[PDB]
Amino acid sequence: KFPRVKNWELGSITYDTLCAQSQQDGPCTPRRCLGSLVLPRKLQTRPSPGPPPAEQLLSQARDFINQYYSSIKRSGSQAHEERLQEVEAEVASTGTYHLRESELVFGAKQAWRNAPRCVGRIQWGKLQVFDARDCSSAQEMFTYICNHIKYATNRGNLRSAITVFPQRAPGRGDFRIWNSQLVRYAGYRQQDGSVRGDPANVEITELCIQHGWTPGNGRFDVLPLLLQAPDEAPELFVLPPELVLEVPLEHPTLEWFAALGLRWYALPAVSNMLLEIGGLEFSAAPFSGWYMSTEIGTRNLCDPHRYNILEDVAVCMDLDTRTTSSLWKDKAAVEINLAVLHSFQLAKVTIVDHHAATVSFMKHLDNEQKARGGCPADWAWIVPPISGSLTPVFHQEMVNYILSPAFRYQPDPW
Amino acid sequence: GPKFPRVKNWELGSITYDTLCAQSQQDGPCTPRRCLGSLVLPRKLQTRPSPGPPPAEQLLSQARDFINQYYSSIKRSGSQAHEERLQEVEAEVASTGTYHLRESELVFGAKQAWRNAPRCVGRIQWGKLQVFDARDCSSAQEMFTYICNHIKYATNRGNLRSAITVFPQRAPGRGDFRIWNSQLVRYAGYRQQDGSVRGDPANVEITELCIQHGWTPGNGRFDVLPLLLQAPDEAPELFVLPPELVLEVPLEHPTLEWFAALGLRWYALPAVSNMLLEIGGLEFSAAPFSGWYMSTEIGTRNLCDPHRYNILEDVAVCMDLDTRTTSSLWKDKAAVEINLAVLHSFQLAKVTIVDHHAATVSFMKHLDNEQKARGGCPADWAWIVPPISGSLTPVFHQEMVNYILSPAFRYQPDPW
Lengths: 414, 416
Ligand code: HEM
Ligand code: HEM
Ligand SMILES: Nc1nc(N)c2c(n1)NC[C@@H](c1ccccc1)N2
Ligand SMILES: Nc1nc(N)c2c(n1)NC[C@@H](c1ccccc1)N2
Ligand SMILES: [Zn+2]
Known about the structure:
The structure is a homodimer.
Chain A (H helix, E strand, L loop, with lengths): L3 E3 L6 E3 L38 H18 L6 H17 L6 H14 L13 E4 L6 H16 L7 E4 L11 E2 L9 E3 L5 E3 L4 H9 L14 E4 L6 E3 L8 E3 L14 E3 L3 E2 L3 E4 L2 E3 L4 E2 L4 H10 L7 H7 L11 H19 L7 H19 L6 H4 L17 E2 L4 E3 L6
Parallel strand pairs in A: 3-4
Antiparallel strand pairs in A: 1-2, 4-15, 5-8, 6-7, 8-9, 10-11, 12-15, 13-14, 13-17
Helix pairs in contact in A: 1-2, 6-8, 7-8
The complex binds protoporphyrin IX containing FE (2 copies), 2,4-diamino-6-phenyl-5,6,7,8,-tetrahydropteridine (2 copies) and zinc ion.
One 2,4-diamino-6-phenyl-5,6,7,8,-tetrahydropteridine sits at the interface of chains B and A.
């Protein structure tokens, strides 16, 4: 029943009992494990043209309300029972309900706390929640988003935040941010199929031009935002330059590195995920924190399907790209990650290296074992893309499961 | 579309469907509720000692399945010899409670067990395996001779050759053949007065067992341990490997001249000896197998794990790095040079070895071959992706499906 979890570096053992609370199903079964899969077959979040079944919604809601009043230790009070009534009363009559602002804040924080793929959860209790549920146009979304970016960036002293737009409603379209992140670099597909810029953003770059954007021809052109109000075509909004803090990349010792013209933005803000709290769904709720250096230095810059600059740098370092055994890739990667940390630290922009991050996560695991008797963690995502076993999380067994509130993936609006 | 797991490679955008997993009969550790895919030893496969003879029926279905697998491989399914062999197997099990494998069946099963190993990244070589049939062995002494012959053939003076030696299978009402050591080559781990460990911390328990069995301990960081070989119903017997049989490689660095002064080294032959080989329900408790090293096994895990040799800090200090702050990436820099040293040293000594880049690239080819040949390939992502430079290799971006197929190599309880 309850899994025996072991840390092989320390020999310590814990028993995860928090997974018993998981009401949702993952992709695995006894016959085979799909734990390495990036996306579900359909766990997503299907359309909302019709009202969700009252019995089910009612149980998800009651559960959440219980979680909330338990958090403020008023579990069992009259306020607790009267809230349950309000929810039940609203669901029976309208087939849905709404959250009190304080509940939304608790839910947003809990959703982050429960995110199996997030290594920065030690900061889960510190999150600025912007209630944007009174938004009625793409234009309003834009203002809210600009407010978020301004607050989160904080001139380099990044602060974790989330802006919650109106929940999905049965019958009408969803509020949606088409871009996967608030800040993305364009990816211009050329004649021969190749790409200029960030290959991960070819599709969204094309959709933007399709909706009237005047593109550029650089590798780091900040894309505009395509915001979508219910049952309306998305609108294009160019983010104000002064709001998008970027950090130019240079290396502490290699003078030629800066000449590469590489750079990256300071704010990591996912905007395509769905936030589920007590059965309610927020199709537009962008959240941001700060980068862990490997995200930029290892994945964004070195992935073959991303900027793929490994050989460029290796050649500049005069390394032997002839054979794999010279470890030219490993050497180049290290300097690239070093340049990222150096540049951000020099620019006074919040950043965390993978060693510090995983060290904090181990502490978080400890806190959670005492607090909830477990912690859902996706080993493949928690262990960094470089120096895996050099970090403590590599040697820590983990249990992965779905808890709610949760951040979930959802279909692209197009 | 298809009703099987959809598998995507995000670097290339290519898709495949694993249909082979439909062949799995043994359950793993995961459930729809929670994924236990990262546990090193989940309690399922675990071939716990099942003394009293196994259910004739259970063994039979496992036996028939294997026999079917065998005749399929030689393309004689449903044939004359096929149905006769099946009759012959249940005939043996009928009167004796067990059965025996033909020579060619053992060879096929052994290669298939390797092929089926989800945690092995060198499976592209699965077809080239020297199978030493040692089912006639009747003494711990003979086990040693076979083992020595194995090491000699497999080492081939630096030009390693994959091989496995199979000792008598588990027999009802009779003890097992067991090799107590986890590997044929293991460095002693001495528990110091101050509590620390000299040598390899991983082998502390086996070292203490050798001592408790008459071995006179040394006091170095790289003392090769003796083998504790066990024949049926006999206490373990201690055997010392002739030094000339144990090829080792002194580690040095291509440019950092001081690295050789560290006195580091590692043996050439990786030979796992505590795993159980299961074929058609028959259990081969003693069946050591070996191939050649992937450099990160030595340079990253064996030499840099905090609970292994833990040399990261020492090497960093020698490189004059800032070991006081994580953002200097001193761990990353030192690890790289240690891995490079291992590759360089083996190359110089003309000893077989493969870097993590080459290995993973070849494993991708293995995946393509297997997609066509069997419609999939069971793989443990956490074990296939290298301990360093993970996303710099092609396997990181490859989704994988993990499941148990038999014949298989399974973990088993320690004999003590
Ligand atoms: C405080 C700093 C934070 C750091 C350093 C951090 C770090 C990380 C890292 C490295 C990843 C994997 C990124 C990738 O590979 O694409 C991740 C994923 C994730 N983080 Fe955190 N995180 C932080 C804050 C947050 C915040 C504020 C939230 C939400 C309130 C959050 C929610 C998530 C979610 C849901 C994922 C999974 C996204 C996906 O599936 O692509 N994180 N985080
Ligand atoms: C030809 C060279 C080969 C290479 C480069 C190779 C490489 C590897 C590597 C990197 C591991 C993981 C090591 C660890 O982290 O402990 C491994 C595991 C494994 N290999 Fe291979 N392998 C090869 C040959 C073999 C052979 C000849 C067999 C069997 C006939 C085999 C069976 C296995 C099994 C069962 C495991 C899993 C061990 C465990 O669970 O602890 N390998 N191999
Ligand atoms: N932090 C993090 N981000 C990812 N995009 C990621 C992982 N880890 N780990 C697994 C990896 C992946 C990619 C493609 C296939 C299978 C696994 N994807
Ligand atoms: N090749 C390889 N060898 C290991 N010993 C190993 C992995 N991969 N990947 C996972 C890792 C591990 C250790 C401890 C806990 C959880 C995962 N163990
Ligand atoms: Zn799983």
